Amino acid sequence: PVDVSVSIFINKIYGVNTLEQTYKVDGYIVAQWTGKPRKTPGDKPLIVENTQIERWINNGLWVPALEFINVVGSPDTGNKRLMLFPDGRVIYNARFLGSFSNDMDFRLFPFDRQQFVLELEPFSYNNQQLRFSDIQVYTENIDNEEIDEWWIRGKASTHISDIRYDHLSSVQPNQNEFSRITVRIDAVRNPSYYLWSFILPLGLIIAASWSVFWLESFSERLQTSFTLMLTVVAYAFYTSNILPRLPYTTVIDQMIIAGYGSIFAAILLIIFAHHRQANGVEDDLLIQRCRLAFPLGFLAIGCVLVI
Amino acid sequence: PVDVSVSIFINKIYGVNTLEQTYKVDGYIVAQWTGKPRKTPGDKPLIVENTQIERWINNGLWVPALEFINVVGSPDTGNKRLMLFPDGRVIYNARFLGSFSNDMDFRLFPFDRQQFVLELEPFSYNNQQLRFSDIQVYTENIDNEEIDEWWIRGKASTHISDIRYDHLSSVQPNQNEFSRITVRIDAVRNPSYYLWSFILPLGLIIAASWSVFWLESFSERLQTSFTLMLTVVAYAFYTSNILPRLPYTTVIDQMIIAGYGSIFAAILLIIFAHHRQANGVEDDLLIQRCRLAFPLGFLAIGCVLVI
Amino acid sequence: PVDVSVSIFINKIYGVNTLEQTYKVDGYIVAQWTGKPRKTPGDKPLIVENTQIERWINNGLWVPALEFINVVGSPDTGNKRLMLFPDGRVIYNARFLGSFSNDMDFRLFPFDRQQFVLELEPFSYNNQQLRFSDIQVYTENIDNEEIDEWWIRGKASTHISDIRYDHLSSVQPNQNEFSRITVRIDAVRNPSYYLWSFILPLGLIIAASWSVFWLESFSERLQTSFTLMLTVVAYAFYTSNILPRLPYTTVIDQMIIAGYGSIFAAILLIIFAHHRQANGVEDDLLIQRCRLAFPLGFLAIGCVLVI
Amino acid sequence: PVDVSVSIFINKIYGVNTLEQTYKVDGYIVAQWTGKPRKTPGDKPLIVENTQIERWINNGLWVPALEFINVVGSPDTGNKRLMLFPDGRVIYNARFLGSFSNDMDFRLFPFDRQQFVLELEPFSYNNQQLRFSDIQVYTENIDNEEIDEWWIRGKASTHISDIRYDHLSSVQPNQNEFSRITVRIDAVRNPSYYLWSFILPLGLIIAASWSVFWLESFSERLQTSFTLMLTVVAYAFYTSNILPRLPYTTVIDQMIIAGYGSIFAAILLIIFAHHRQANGVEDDLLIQRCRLAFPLGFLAIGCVLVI
Amino acid sequence: PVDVSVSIFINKIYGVNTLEQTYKVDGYIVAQWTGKPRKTPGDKPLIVENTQIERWINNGLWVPALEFINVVGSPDTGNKRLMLFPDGRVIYNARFLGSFSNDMDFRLFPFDRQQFVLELEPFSYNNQQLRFSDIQVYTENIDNEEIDEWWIRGKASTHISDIRYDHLSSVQPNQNEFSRITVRIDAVRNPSYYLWSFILPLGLIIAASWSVFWLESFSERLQTSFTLMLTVVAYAFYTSNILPRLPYTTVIDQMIIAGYGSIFAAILLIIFAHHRQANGVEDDLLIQRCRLAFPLGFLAIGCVLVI
């Protein structure tokens, strides 16, 4: 086997998206290995630019085709470069940019934790083993934590493993080990935007839904509650482009469900606190009579769902 | 004829879209056949990477152009390689990433069942017969049932058919039958999102629509209804984002059709219950007592009849 | 001149779009002409795949560059193939997938009827005359009854014509005849979706906007109307994404205009029936104080027009 | 220098975009110059198709690289063609499609008079002088008056000018003057769509804003106005996808501003006419009663503007 | 080392986007250096067009690969050119068009002062030192200030720095310093659109929220605020498409927060001014018969939000 020492320089992780759980990454790969010695012009290293590499691959040079595993589509490779040394070693350097994909857990949506993963791997050769993955992070999200949405903690985490591909039993089935380099960068979502756009107004609407008790005419109270129905409906589309069709409810979907349920219970407890009267007046039947401790007693039932 | 054994490795089926009934598929293809023997450098199998293949086809190598039938556009092939063995056989291996299209049936929308189909076929040859398909699928199945909207049941299903093409009747009669490989993957939609976003709130709005019958002031029994009209109009648009323009009503669209009438009929059961008399300028007295059966107790029949 | 016999196999006409009047088409072209005899390996028709064609064109083979006229952006050709026969004839076969553009007439929108047009033509040669077109259309959408939005009635109609190009008077003004193949496929829109989403709710709002006559409190008969003016405007956006910026009014636009007019006329008849200088009388038993004659008398104000 | 007479056949101008001031153009270019005589096969003109040009440029043929100045991105060139004559002249013909960009002025929006500009220019040579420009435009003009949004008036205007380029002052002083070919087509927007979608309903809301003065119950004359506030807010969004966020106000923006101001004044002249004292000991409650002169006196407050 | 003088001609900066902080730039690059003398045909500068460069690189010409650092993807290069002089120097000229990326600070959103940055840098050579960057910008500065959203004031400032790359210790660690050219252009947003679309109407809504105090029926003083809630929610989505998910609140976000808080405080003040009677039932006329003395304290705090 031949030894290949990779070096990944990350330039900027941008374009994050939660509807598809993707993120665009840009950077440089620098792979380096050792082959047979050679005679170069003069006695210096020989640099070979974008299209001059094909003429060297045609004549018999060995250059592996390193690919990214968790990529959507195919990366948009910029320039390329080879640097043939006279002592024997070779250094393939190339710029990459691609939309990678990972798995995200939005069970606690606004206060979220993810990790961006890059999985590099040879495409054709089973016996060429990556020795040591090094990563250099030059991203701007670490030191500008007030403009970005995703803070980046730590530095990185790199692991060199072996993958077993069983679909490659065409080749002798005992020769399908593929070395792989996984690189993880942990990120923390900055929740300070969803706190005054989906938690404060929805909380205010919820707390202002029990105040309809403080009225003299139920004929006005039903319309009062059906007015807040429209606001709670309005805050249901505003949260329809923030996160995907998830089967589990998040901190905001729970607030929307509670906003529906609180108003529905207001209706159901303002109807049955009147439709079993004994006199014939509007505000009676032990809930609408006093209106000094009951309009504040139903307030703590929602706090159970909050707590 | 020559015999070509195919093996398809599916990596991730993502980007499903019911608006156009498409889905993006990523994976690898490994076709393997047998030709004439040859002398290779040393005695090992000779591997030929991305752009070195085009120099072997020029010299006289036989490599078929396999295509996908049900693709939208043209797949974005990644790397590719040949593996020429000295005993004679050849192994063409190549990564693909396409945007395939199937037919979907949303007559029962949220509790849906589909199947993702892939169809390989030679483009130019009729006498080259694919022996057998072997799909190696490891897209997540049991842990995929909490994040992804679809669940992958079973393992797979592969068949090998013989299509007869009529537009190629210019050539000899027997020479217009191409073999084809079809691969089906059954999937079940996770309906747990449309149960607290389009059925729970609509189900409450439906039942909170005849509550206006439990009122006294006809001067407001129309405003309390025209507010729910606007609520149902609000939910009407929030559904046009999900589904295509289907001529048959789904399980959700019906809850919208029953959202106008159940409200609309309300007026038609209020108005005709308001002027049952020919004397008096004020409301109708004798009708305000039997409201429990005809005005409101009939939508209970509307709920137990169709459901 | 040389005689070319095109044959077009249509696979699926998808992605129709009325905002730009485009439609994507996928299929195969099979052109076939006769040249001079030649010696092929063995005595078989020699097949030439994707990239081997550009090498046969170098040595002096004649292959015309057929183009599509009414295409939006150059198409996305998939595989290509030549079939050089020993007796002399040549068969150029190639897959195409492109987004074509036709003209549409939405003067009667929901019950529409269009035709998809494909125009093929040589790009460089004036003296090479397409002889006989042949459409092979086993499309997946004529077997439709309630699946897709467009039914297909007949599936084929072809015509071979000539064209005079004036910008090509650089050559002698006689050498600018360009034979062209036109292929028309008549399609009929499935109106069963716009009947219970734009004709039913608007049709009910129209008749529910004149019901405000059955009231007595003019202090509230103007507010109960402005909650309906808020409904008709809600369907004015729901229509702005299913049609282009058309000068002529469709059926749905006519319905929305009639809704605006009906609500405005209701307001004006309410105001004039109360107090003004055009009548002078104060609160007669006009449209407000009557519940039988006039609230059913304005039913022919909208039912006078024919469409 | 060498004289190159360019002809331009305009096939269709579509995809106009008010939000970005772009428009896609599809057409042909036919440049033609004279060089040195040559011997061609036979005695006929020699036609050279798409990829055979790049081999004639290798041997020493002179073909200029004509670029488009005001293009967004790079155009999508379709087929190409050369026609080498034996007498010496050469005719380079090529199909083009590109998203061009001009400057537009929406100070009077619906009745626009924008114009479409195409700017062709050599990229490398200053001494090659475009000598004569013909445009051959047969895009739909007088039948375009009912389906397309823009009418074409006159269809053609061309001019050949010279740009002095300062960034090329590294070369000799006289050798940075590049000729051009400018092509201007006169378009006129068809305003018949914005007259019954943004002017009729907005005007009806304007006229229905003072109608609240025909009331007595001040306790509801604020709700009857806060409903029209919501109506004007609804129409405020329906305009935000037509105009490119212009600093100057168009007609519709002026109408929205008037819709805010009219209702705000209606509020401010209701509140200060409610507690307006008669003499200082009893509130004047007779200004609101007179509903003949006062409600009409507000109609001319908006009709003072002459736009 | 090789001394390379760079000139950059900027043609138009369009497509600015603040939701992701990009901007598309189009222009020309002219790099010029000195090599070894040579004999050219005749005695003139030899011009080499797009596809003829890749041949001169084959024979041994030295052309550097200059990349852009802060680009999203890879620029869409148009034409290229080489101008080989006989005295020795070479002039590589090429058109570029790419979507760049800078950092923007919306802490004071409408009155923005963002700036546009371009960064050239060699990709492969460290001993290839750019001498002196000149920039030629004719992006309009005085006449454009009424049509486009971003004024461009002053000249563009250019700086040649040296970056040290740590990930390039593969090559001898004392030769990893690459020169870089940075070009900054000063932009200033034209805040004449957000003044009559997000500050004027929001200001009128905020100033019309305290006006509910001048009312008599508290049974209706609670519905007015719940109607204003809907308008304040309507002005909350209209802002969610002009800004990114920013943690710091802008001016418009502060206005939305103040609009929520003003109506919430109005509710909490009016409900307590009602509860002052030691109940919430039996509305009395004491608050209106003293509306000129007592409730002025409820508005006196409402004008503290301003100062």
User: From start to end of A72-133, where are the E strands?
Assistant: 80-84, 89-101, 113-122, 129-130
Is residue C16 classed as helix, strand or coil in its secondary structure? strand
DSSP designation for A197: I
Chain D residues 42-61 with CB within 8 Å of chain E: 54, 57-58
As a whole number of angstroms, the distance between CA E172 and CA E187 comes to: 42
Instruction: Give the neighbours of chain A: at least 3 Cβ pairs within 8 Å.
Output: B, E
Selection from A36, A305, A298, A67 nearest residue A178 by Cα: A67
Half-sphere exposure in the Cβ direction for C37 (13 Å, CA): 5
Asked if residue C283 lies in contact with residue C289, where contact means CB atoms within 8 angstroms, the answer is yes
Residue in this structure with the two tokens 């006498």, named with its chain if needed: B127
The structure tokens listed for D87 are 């007498």
DSSP string, C165-179: -STTTTS-TTS-B--
- Cα–Cα distance between D179 and E307 in angstroms, integer? 62
Contacts of D165 (CB under 8 A, 6+ apart): D176, D177, D178, E9
Q: Is A271 on the interface with B (CB under 8 A)?
A: yes
Q: Do E219 and A215 touch (CB under 8 A)?
A: yes
Residues of B within 8 A of C83 (CB-CB) are: 171
User: Phi and psi (nearest 5°) for C44?
Assistant: -105, 160
Cα(E67)–Cα(E130) distance, rounded to whole angstroms? 13
B172 CB near a chain C CB, below 8 Å? no
Extended strands (E) in chain E: 2-17, 22-34, 46-48, 66-68, 80-84, 89-101, 115-122, 128-137, 150-152, 157-164, 177-189
Q: How far apart are CA A34 and CA A86, in angstroms?
A: 11
Query: Which chains neighbour B (Cβ–Cβ under 8 Å, 3 or more pairs)?
Result: A, C
Cβ under 8 Å to E: A residues 197-216 = 197, 200-201, 204-205, 208, 211-216
Number of C-beta neighbours around residue A21 at 10 A: 18
Q: Rounded to whole angstroms, how far apart are CA atoms B226 and B221?
A: 9
Q: Do D233 and E228 touch (CB under 8 A)?
A: no
Question: Which residues, in sequence order, are CB contacts of E14 under 8 Å at separation 6+?
Answer: D72, D101, E23, E24, E26
The answer to whether the CB of C97 falls within 8 A of the CB of C79 is: no
Evaluated on CA atoms E262, E263, E264, E270, the torsion sign reads positive
Query: What distance in Å separates the CA atoms of residue C228 and residue C236, rounded to the nearest whole number?
Result: 13
What length does chain D have?
A: 307
Report the amino acid identity of residue D137.
Answer: V
Closest approach of A172 to chain E, Cα-based (Å): 36
Asked if E225 has any chain D CB less than 8 Å from its own CB, the reply is no
Residue E41 CA neighbour count, 13 Å, CB half: 5
Give the count of beta carbons closer than 10 Å to the beta carbon of residue D260.
18
Q: Which residues contact A63 (CB under 8 A, 6 or more apart)?
A: A53, A56, A57, A82, A90, A92
Backbone phi, then psi, for B285, in 5-degree steps?
-90, -45
Q: Is A205 left (phi over 0), alpha (psi -120 to 50) or beta?
A: alpha
Nearest CA in chain A to B55: A58
Q: What is the layout of strands, in order, in the sheet containing C8-17?
A: C46-48, C80-84, C89-101, C22-34, C8-17, C135-137
The contacts found for D261-269 with CB under 8 angstroms, 24 or more apart, are D262/D206, D262/D209, D262/D210, D262/D301, D262/D302, D263/D209, D263/D225, D263/D228, D263/D229, D263/D232, D264/E204, D264/E208, D265/D301, D266/D209, D266/D210, D266/D212, D266/D213, D266/D225, D266/D298, D267/D222, D267/D225, D267/E208, D267/E211, D269/D298
DSSP classification of residue B274: H
Other C-beta atoms closer than 10 Å to the C-beta of A102 total: 15
Residue B303's contacts (CB-CB under 8 Å, 6 or more residues apart) are: none
Q: What is residue A5's three-state secondary structure?
A: strand
Q: Judged by CB atoms within 8 Å, which residues 58-77 of E form the interface with A?
A: 58, 63, 65, 67, 69, 72-74
Nearest partner of C305 among C264, C251, C224, C239, judged by Cα: C251
Is D275 in contact with E214 (CB distance < 8 Å)? yes
Helix (H/G/I), strand (E/B), else coil: C87: coil
Can you tell me whether residue E188 is helix, strand or coil?
A: strand
Q: What is the DSSP string of chain D?
A: --EEEEEEEEEEEEEEETTTTEEEEEEEEEEEEE------STTS-EEE-TTTHHHHHHHT-----EEESSBSS------EEEEE-SSSEEEEEEEEEEEEE-----TT-TT---EEEEEEEESS-SS-EEEEEEEEE----SSTTTTSSEEEES---EE--EEE-STTTTS-TTS-EEE-EEEEEEEEE-GGGTTTTTTHHHHHHHHTTGGGGS-S-TTTTTHHHHHHHHHHHHHHHTTTTTS---SS--HHHHHHHHHHHHHHHHHHHHHTTTS-BSSSSSB--STTT--SHHHHHTGGGTTT---
How was this one solved? cryo-EM
DSSP string, B217-229: -HHHHTHHHHHHH
**What is the maximal distance between C-alpha atoms in chain E?**
107
Nearest CA to A214 out of E276, E222, E209, E286 is that of E222
Q: Measured between alpha carbons, how far is A290 from A283 in angstroms, rounded to an integer?
A: 9
Angle at B264 between CA B260 and CA B267, to 5 degrees: 160
List the one residue out of C37, C11, C7, C40 whose CA is nearest residue C25: C11
Are B185 and B115 spatial neighbours (Cβ–Cβ below 8 Å)?
yes
Strand pairing category for C129-130 and C3-4: parallel
D81 contact residues in C (CB cutoff 8 A): 65, 123-124
Give the chain D residue whose CA is nearest to the CA of E47. D124
Helix (H) or strand (E) run with residue B230 in it = helix B223-237
3-state secondary structure of E125: coil
In angstroms, rounded to a whole number, what is the distance separating the alpha carbons of residues B11 and B138?
A: 7
- Candidates E196, E223, E291; nearest CB to D257: E196
Q: Where are the alpha helices (DSSP H) in A238-294?
A: 251-271
- Residues in CB range of A165: below 8 A, 6 or more apart: A176, A178, B9
Instruction: Evaluate whether B10 touches B134 at the Cβ level (below 8 Å).
Output: no
Query: What backbone phi and psi angles, to 5 degrees, belong to A211?
Result: -75, -5
State the smallest CA–CA distance between residue D160 and chain C in angstroms.
19
Cβ–Cβ under 8 Å, residues A47 and A219: no
The alpha-carbon radius of gyration of chain E (Å, integer) is: 31
Contact E76 D72 (CB under 8 A): no
Helix (H) or strand (E) holding C207: helix C200-209
CA E174 to chain centroid, in Å, comes to 38
Provide the β-strand partners of residue A22.
Answer: A17, A101
Question: Who's near D78: CB < 8 A, 6+ residues apart?
Answer: C67, C74, C123, D94, D95, D96, D97
Residue E122: CB atoms within 10 A of its CB come to 22
Resolution in A: 3.3
Report the alpha-carbon distance of residue D292 to residue A161 in Å, rounded.
89
Beta bridge partners of D120: D68, D181
β-pairing, E128-137 vs E2-17, is parallel
Query: Residue C245: its chain D contacts at CB < 8 A?
Result: 149, 193
Asked if residue B229 lies in contact with residue C231, where contact means CB atoms within 8 angstroms, the answer is yes
Is the separation of the CB atoms in D219 and E285 below 8 Å? no
